[PDB]
Design a protein around this ligand. Structure first.
Ligand SMILES: CC(C)C[C@H](N)C(=O)O
Ligand SMILES: CC(C)C[C@H](N)C(=O)O
Lengths: 231, 232
């Protein structure tokens, strides 16, 4: 299997052909052009690879996902948010947010300048979005991802101050479900993501949901840059 | 005659009182704010002016239009599309399409940073849409415009590869016709648009349709980003 892409085509092989180990490895090569990424997200595929390696494309089985309404907020966090010291915005500083996720030397080490430029293009074309957390005038956290109708693909999140991440995710979810949102894609289940309510589901089911929710929509102004939470 | 708009009011004068030559010159000034732009379209007025000049608003008589079903496709163009090398999408890259038209260097030269931002806002707001044509991984054409119910005002289109904009309009028309689309506004006829089957009707007639179709409605999700046609 494992198809090798090229500049001559933006089409990917079927997700069902992905490898078992590593989980979901479907293709390598191509580029991070706006059209190829959209095609990918449209088919439940996403790019991830370490700096120095060719572009690797995935669609694991199972797929880690998060039902907005199932977001788990600790009793402590709720008390924290009740008197939150942060304010949350939407699409105010995408560059800073993705650069925030990049600078942390962990899972975000895969975010190279090439990746940053690629997603900043999707954000400029209106498909990639960011939620920003502010402490005074400083960005202390947030998250970003690619929208797919009523489905949201969460690429990553970062935090430079206690409870910043949870805040962005807490408020976003309220906003999301409040206006039609139905699902958040987390790709691969991990400890932190699992502690927040993320659960695994068969890839085939994820695909069902995806081509089902990508043709849906949220209010015309749902992604317009604005303030989301401010006491 | 012809009025100076004000940053104060977002209202327009009766299109029927426009000049004959230059055809349709109705007003000047104002700004390109969403509210005002959206209002002009509602009234069958559109902005057009060269860099350096003040905003100019127009409503020509006659008006150029295109009945979707009457789109003319040559026999060799059908042969081409039958085995098409292009991919067509909706709202995948409005900014790139508009910049593509601005780069035309013929008359896309009126499209300044200001005009681009103004139409970008209407896109952000969901009133302006684009149709992209891809060849492999490259954007080779497309068109963008403002939706007005079952009426669509085609602002402009561009081509970087043979038959690109024709397949853009061909695929769009099929999509548009299939879900309730009634008319495409072309503003002012030009050899190319004329070969595609566009024609001229009296301004009072166009306005008549406009006021009828702006009430019409297409599927609630007609404009969400998606692929409309995939090559083979
Ligand atoms: C919303 C989150 C699931 C985003 C990203 N997948 C992460 O693990 O941080
Ligand atoms: C897109 C076309 C059908 C209309 C546009 N005004 C043009 O002449 O390019």
């Amino acid at each position: 299997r494992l198809v090798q892409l090229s500049r001559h085509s933006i089409a990917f092989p079927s997700p069902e052909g992905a490898l078992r180990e590593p989980n979901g490895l479907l293709a390598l090569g191509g580029d991070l052009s706006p059209a190829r990424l959209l095609m990918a997200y449209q088919r439940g595929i996403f790019p991830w690879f370490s700096p120095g390696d060719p572009i690797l494309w995935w669609s694991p089985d199972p797929r880690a996902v998060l039902w907005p309404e199932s977001l788990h907020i600790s009793r402590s966090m709720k008390r924290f948010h009740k008197r939150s010291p942060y304010r949350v915005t939407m699409n105010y500083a995408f560059g800073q947010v993705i650069e925030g996720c990049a600078s942390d030397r962990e899972e975000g080490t895969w975010i190279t300048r090439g990746v940053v430029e690629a997603y900043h293009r999707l954000h400029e074309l209106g498909h990639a979005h960011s939620i920003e957390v502010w402490r005074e005038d400083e960005l202390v956290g947030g998250m970003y991802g690619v929208a797919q109708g009523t489905l949201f693909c969460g690429e990553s999140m970062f935090s430079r101050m206690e409870n910043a991440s949870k805040t962005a995710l807490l408020v976003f979810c309220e906003e999301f479900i409040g206006h039609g949102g139905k699902l958040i894609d987390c790709q691969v289940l991990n400890d932190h993501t699992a502690s927040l309510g993320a659960c695994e589901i068969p890839r085939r089911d994820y695909l069902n949901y995806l081509n089902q929710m990508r043709l849906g929509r949220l209010p015309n102004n749902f992604w317009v840059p604005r303030c989301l939470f401010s006491p």
